[PDB]
Ligand binder design. Structure first.
Ligand SMILES: Cc1cc2nc3c(=O)[nH]c(=O)nc-3n(C[C@H](O)[C@H](O)[C@H](O)COP(=O)(O)OP(=O)(O)OC[C@H]3O[C@@H](n4cnc5c(N)ncnc54)[C@H](O)[C@@H]3O)c2cc1C
Ligand SMILES: Cc1cc2nc3c(=O)[nH]c(=O)nc-3n(C[C@H](O)[C@H](O)[C@H](O)COP(=O)(O)OP(=O)(O)OC[C@H]3O[C@@H](n4cnc5c(N)ncnc54)[C@H](O)[C@@H]3O)c2cc1C
Lengths: 406, 405
């Protein structure tokens, strides 16, 4: 078989990052990345792309551009993983063996589970920031919005960036107020959750925003059908099975149901639910000692965000390093994550918490306040540092800056 | 080859729906896809694990429950292409259907617990969910001398969610009926935050937990079993990263469960791998000639054989009015039953619907530990299961309840 010392599944955020970090541990020539996509995206920025504040093109680079120099890019898809034989299968009908494996295959979008999707996106008035094919469709729907209901959905599955489905809603509201349309929009959030956020500090802040801006939130409603030709939407009452609700929309933002990538759903590396079964503290796999997981594909009980990835990568670097010297790992991931909640074209509530869903703010000021400093950080500084220091391997936890600021 | 009605699975719902479709389209236009030689009445496995009933009485050969004239395709579904109205089996066949009844059950995932299924080669450890492990429960109960008796509950959907604690109450009876109670620390370690999701029988069960010195540790999910050293490892779901290693003199495993693998990636599933059916008619939300019944579905009620029975009546009506080009009208209420065995002598029969609210068949109060409910669970339901339900003649308990009120 073809064989690499370190094999990285996925060339997204965690993939590129771990590969960059592993290049400096083992030599670039002994690292390989398996990734089908030719484009690598900083998906956070799609929130502002859907709101017309930032451009799609800037969100991407060619996968080759961000592959660390001298690392092998296997442009293919993983189709099987045999951890007991230390190998994987690709759609090129190859078998690749590894000495260590890093699984960084992200999370899967499942638009097709909504009846009438992905087909309905050929019609106007409907967008979704979660896909390169539908995000500008959000923005165009927001521009063409003239009058009616503007509906934002949140599914009954795990998601990545759980704040983004409401982020776009706040931006849509502010777009309406800055264009003389606010009076003719009835803005609805139909979420599958029972609360507006999981960390009470920011939940309270967002709630105050909901009240002070005439926003309607319907809990335990889940979108199950779209009739785009009729500009209608169908939601189910999770609290009372059997009940559906057909409602007309002038603008619709879909957050699709999500799941572990089909290849993992049946893989021996998954837990029962499909995710990479990793030790919660070291990111080493619970059953295969030479396997590691990072990012959205894992069962790390925390938010699936790229900030989480960055913190994780620092932990996993140390985990793998010491495992290689046959010592027992010591450093422990704390669950750090962050949702920079965009509440307007000029304001972000920077939410940062840990495994215990308690605040863990980096800065000494109160980040539950709508701040301009935090908006500029989300829209301009983070994308730059993503390309130029996170993907080169030099951004981990913000624990040091958090201590540095106190 | 082609069939008017194709049923995927020869367990409870499959056999039931196949019996029901035979009287609709003729036996010659029905077929059951199933790989097992044996069909089990899994509910009684609870009493087998307590040594009250026998593992042989709990199953029969699959041939013996197939309705006469219905084709038994001894294979396993390997692919479902509903957009072409076909499936692929592991003997490399492709089978076309006009209508599809997906009745594939739930899948046991013992291998997600490190140390399993291998550790069942050791004593002091059993599990009532598997025909290969249910008699080990009984022996672990007999062999018991001194220490902790641990009963687990995973962080997955499960079938008969009351069963994991049933075998605990039974074990507590056994220990008292053998002079061993005084030297038995009986703990239930659950992923869940509640003993039971319906307040009326929860409260009943909690009085029993208090009156019999049973401790319940919530949000503790088993993740490792060292049968060699008779240790179990739990993760604290309330404190990610936190674990706890516990020695056992008896370990009863409820394994993580999930949709069957063939469904997990199938276009008929929702994002979580369950058959994505209408919650009232059991017709598929996106494929109008596909239907689902039982554990494999996403029906938001308890995966139980009792739920199958009520579902099978509604599914029967739903499929008949569709063949007649009419829209379905009768709606499933979410009925399911859990006959909570609370000893060798009593049973708290929980019956409820979609609203997690009690929907009892009998006029008296089923929160109470009743002898009659034990003999129903232990002798009648098995008899009625083989003799009415698998033949298509038991469905909803709607009228029986209306009768008694
Ligand atoms: C609209 C939106 C807004 C967001 N905003 C934020 C934010 O503000 N902050 C934040 O921290 N996060 C945010 N995120 C989430 C963030 O992008 C992710 O959490 C992060 O990308 C996780 O990285 P990952 O490496 O696990 O997966 P990804 O970066 O998605 O990459 C996974 C890769 O695996 C590849 N792959 C998939 N299947 C296979 C296969 N079978 N074989 C091989 N390769 C495969 C994919 O092609 C992909 O390149 C947002 C996401 C969205 C959609
Ligand atoms: C210990 C225990 C106690 C229980 N007690 C009770 C109780 O007291 N009351 C109650 O109401 N319920 C009880 N149940 C629940 C009951 O067993 C199930 O809910 C019921 O059997 C569900 O039926 P089903 O048709 O959905 O699947 P099953 O009856 O489990 O059968 C599914 C079938 O699908 C087949 N299959 C799987 N994959 C494939 C494939 N790829 N291709 C083809 N065929 C396949 C399997 O071989 C199996 O025959 C209990 C269950 C257990 C395990």
């Amino acid at each position: 078989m073809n064989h690499y010392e370190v094999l990285v599944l996925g060339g997204g955020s965690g993939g590129i990052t771990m590969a960059a970090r592993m290049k400096r541990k083992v030599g670039a020539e002994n690292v390989a990345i398996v990734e089908p996509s030719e484009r690598h995206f900083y998906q956070p920025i799609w929130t502002l792309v859907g709101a017309g504040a930032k451009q799609l093109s800037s969100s991407g680079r060619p996968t080759a551009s961000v592959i660390p120099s001298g690392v092998e890019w296997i442009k293919a898809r993983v189709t099987e993983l045999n951890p007991d034989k230390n190998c994987i299968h690709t759609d090129d009908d190859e078998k690749i063996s590894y000495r260590y494996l890093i699984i960084a295959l992200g999370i899967q979008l499942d638009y097709e589970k909504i009846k009438g999707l992905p087909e309905g996106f050929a019609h106007p008035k409907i967008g979704s920031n979660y896909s390169v094919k539908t995000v500008e469709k959000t923005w165009k729907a927001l521009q063409d919005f003239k009058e009616g209901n503007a509906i934002f959905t949140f599914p009954n599955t795990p998601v990545k960036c759980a704040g983004a489905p409401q982020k776009i809603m706040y931006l849509s509201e502010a777009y309406f107020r800055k264009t003389g349309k606010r009076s003719k929009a009835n803005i609805i959030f139909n979420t599958s959750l029972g609360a507006i956020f999981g960390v009470k500090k920011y939940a309270d802040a967002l709630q105050e925003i909901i009240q002070e801006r005439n926003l309607t939130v319907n809990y335990k409603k889940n979108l199950i059908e779209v009739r785009a030709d009729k500009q209608e939407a169908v939601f189910e009452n999770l609290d009372k099975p059997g009940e559906t609700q057909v409602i007309s929309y002038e603008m619709l933002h879909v957050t699709p149901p999500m799941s572990p990538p089909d290849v993992l759903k049946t893989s021996p590396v998954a837990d029962a639910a499909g995710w990479v079964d990793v030790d919660k503290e070291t990111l080493q796999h619970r059953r295969y000692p030479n396997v590691f997981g990072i990012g959205d594909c894992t069962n790390l009980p925390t938010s699936k965000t790229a900030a989480a990835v960055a913190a994780q990568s620092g932990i996993l670097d140390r985990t793998i390093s010491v495992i290689m010297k046959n010592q027992t790992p010591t450093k422990k991931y704390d669950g750090y994550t962050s949702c920079p909640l965009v509440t307007g074209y000029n304001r972000v509530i920077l939410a940062e918490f840990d495994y215990k869903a308690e605040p863990l703010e980096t800065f000494p000021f109160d980040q539950s306040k709508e701040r301009l400093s935090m908006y500029l950080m989300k829209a301009d500084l983070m994308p730059f540092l993503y390309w130029n220091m996170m993907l080169r391997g030099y951004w981990g936890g913000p624990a040091f800056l958090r201590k540095l600021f106190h």
